[PDB]
Ligand binder design. Sequence first.
Ligand SMILES: NC(=O)c1ccc[n+]([C@@H]2O[C@H](COP(=O)([O-])OP(=O)(O)OC[C@H]3O[C@@H](n4cnc5c(N)ncnc54)[C@H](OP(=O)(O)O)[C@@H]3O)[C@@H](O)[C@H]2O)c1
Ligand SMILES: Nc1nc(=O)c2nc(CNc3ccc(C(=O)N[C@@H](CCC(=O)O)C(=O)O)cc3)cnc2[nH]1
Length: 184
Amino acid sequence: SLNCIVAVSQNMGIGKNGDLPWPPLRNEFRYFQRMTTTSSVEGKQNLVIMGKKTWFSIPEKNRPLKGRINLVLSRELKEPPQGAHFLSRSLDDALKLTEQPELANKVDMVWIVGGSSVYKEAMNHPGHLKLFVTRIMQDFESDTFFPEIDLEKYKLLPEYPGVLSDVQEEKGIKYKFEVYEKND
Ligand SMILES: NC(=O)c1ccc[n+]([C@@H]2O[C@H](COP(=O)([O-])OP(=O)(O)OC[C@H]3O[C@@H](n4cnc5c(N)ncnc54)[C@H](OP(=O)(O)O)[C@@H]3O)[C@@H](O)[C@H]2O)c1
Ligand SMILES: Nc1nc(=O)c2nc(CNc3ccc(C(=O)N[C@@H](CCC(=O)O)C(=O)O)cc3)cnc2[nH]1
């Protein structure tokens, strides 16, 4: 299945000057690490698809995201950024690549991890799509925003395996984990 994962502020912001609009939330990042890294199929890895700015928004010491196959999207870059496993010129080229048997046999989940335009194209992609959305319950100054969630297609699930639905809090900031789903 194809999955998006994101943390959004109340104003639906996701980035500010190539970083997150809020201070580091240690447990929310752990959640991101766990969901993207954990495969539900023994012996297979997970694969993350991300835009170019998101890739460089990750501290160099954490690149590539360990335990996961990192794929970057770019139309300008000649070579893949140092540390990336794959480069693709479009979202669909990347998805077509994950379906190649040499990959599919080693890959379980595909995770879209940003940025904005990558989120938008994926959420309108036809098929089975899940959105793992962390609702940060506080407005934050942002220059990049998450696109609209169409509630005529996406349904908020009341629970999901491995996700705590209770309100969380770190550094004084409250947030909750949500999961939306659509089929075709
Ligand atoms: N809160 C969160 O969950 C979250 C998640 C991710 C990112 N962020 C934040 O969001 C910001 C980055 O997001 P962003 O939307 O500004 O940038 P982005 O979408 O990560 O990257 C934009 C660039 O990626 C390439 N690209 C994107 N979509 C493509 C496509 N379909 N095909 C080919 N290339 C494609 C292009 O590079 P070229 O110009 O080379 O073609 C484009 O200029 C940062 O501040 C980051 O910290 C937040
Ligand atoms: N829910 C969610 N939260 C985020 O913070 C998030 N961030 C991005 C993009 N930004 C980043 C920035 C840093 C790292 C990072 O350093 N990841 C490491 C360490 C996590 C940790 O232990 O804090 C990793 O292995 O996940 C990941 C994504 C994309 N989707 C997200 N989705």
